[PDB]
Design a protein around this ligand. Structure first.
Ligand SMILES: C=CC1=C(C)/C(=C/c2[nH]c(/C=C3N=C(/C=C4\NC(=O)C(C)=C4C=C)C(C)=C\3CCC(=O)O)c(CCC(=O)O)c2C)NC1=O
Length: 242
C-alpha cells in the first residue's frame, strides 16, 4: 500500500497519483489482510499487434470488505488508468465504493466515483443518504451521462471530464469524503439477518454483471491480451460474481 515500490506510479497522470495515494491512505490503518486474486495475480503485461498494456493489481480484505481492489494501468505512453472497487461483505449491508479514472496526454478524460447501492430498492442506506446530502452538490463544468449499464450507480455518482486543476482537486476531495463516510459507516454496521444478507449479495452480483457490460474496459484488455483473456480478467479478476 505504500505505493513506494510501484513501477507505474511515478509515470502516471497527477490526478491518478493523488487518488491512488488517497485510497492507500484510507486503507492503510484498517485490519487488512492480502486477498489472493486468481493465480495470485500482481503485475501483468501483454501485447498483441498494437500497444502494450501494463497493470499493477493490489488487493486486500477486512471483515467488512470482501475484496478491496486497486489497479493502476498504462497502455503504451498514451493512456493511464486507475480502478478501485471495495466489494462489501454482504453480511454488513454496506454499499460498493468504486472509482475509475482514465487519462491521456491531454489530461483526464473520465473520472467516475460512487457509493453504489446493494439494497433491492436501489437506495443507499439511510445514514449514507444523510451524510452524502450534507456534502452539497459539487459543480463540474463537463458532466457526462452514464451508459445504460450504469443504472447500477447511485444518484450521488460523479462522472465528469475535469475542466481544470480546481475540478481535479474537487473531485479527489469528494472521493476522500466518500471514503471517510464509508469507513465510518463500516464501524457502525452489524451483521444483518440472513434474508437481508441475501438481498445485499444479490445487489452486489447485479453490480458485477452490469460492470461486465462495459466495452470500454473490454476493448482495452482485448487489444493487448485477446478476447478469452479479457473475459477471464473481467469475470474472474475484476467483477467476480459471488
Ligand atoms: C483495467 C481496468 C480498466 C480499463 C482498461 C478501463 C478503461 C476505460 N474505462 C473507461 C470508461 C468508464 N469507466 C466507467 C466506470 C467504472 N469502470 C470501472 O472499472 C469501475 C469500478 C467503474 C465505476 C465505479 C464508466 C461509467 C465509463 C464510461 C463508459 C462509457 O463512456 O461508455 C474508458 C473510456 C474513457 C473515456 O470515455 O474518456 C476506458 C478506456 N477502466 C478500467 O478500470
Amino acid at each position: 500500500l505504500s505505493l513506494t515500490n510501484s513501477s507505474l506510479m511515478p509515470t502516471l497522470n497527477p490526478m491518478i497519483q493523488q487518488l491512488a495515494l488517497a485510497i492507500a491512505a484510507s486503507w492503510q490503518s484498517l485490519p487488512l489482510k492480502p486477498y489472493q486474486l486468481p493465480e495470485d495475480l500482481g503485475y501483468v503485461e501483454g501485447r498483441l499487434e498494437g500497444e502494450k498494456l501494463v497493470i499493477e493489481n493490489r488487493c486486500y480484505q477486512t471483515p467488512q470488505f470482501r475484496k478491496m481492489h486497486l489497479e493502476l494501468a498504462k497502455v503504451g505512453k498514451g493512456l493511464d488508468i486507475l480502478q478501485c472497487v471495495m466489494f462489501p461483505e454482504p453480511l454488513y449491508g454496506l454499499p460498493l465504493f468504486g472509482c475509475d479514472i482514465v487519462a491521456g496526454p491531454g489530461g483526464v478524460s473520465a473520472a467516475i466515483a460512487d457509493l453504489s447501492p446493494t439494497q433491492s430498492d436501489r437506495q443507499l442506506p439511510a445514514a449514507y443518504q444523510k451524510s452524502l446530502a450534507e456534502l452539497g452538490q459539487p459543480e463540474f463544468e463537463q458532466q457526462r451521462e452514464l451508459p445504460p449499464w450504469g443504472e447500477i450507480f447511485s444518484e450521488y455518482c460523479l462522472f465528469i471530464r475535469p475542466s481544470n486543476v480546481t475540478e481535479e482537486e474537487r473531485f479527489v476531495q469528494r472521493v476522500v469524503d466518500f471514503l471517510q463516510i464509508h469507513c465510518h459507516q463500516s464501524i457502525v454496521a452489524e451483521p444483518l439477518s440472513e434474508a437481508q444478507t441475501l438481498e445485499h449479495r444479490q445487489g452486489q452480483i447485479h453490480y458485477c454483471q452490469q460492470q461486465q457490460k462495459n466495452d470500454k474496459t473490454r476493448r482495452v484488455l482485448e487489444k493487448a491480451f485477446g478476447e478469452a483473456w479479457a473475459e477471464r480478467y473481467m469475470s474472474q479478476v475484476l467483477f467476480d460474481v459471488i
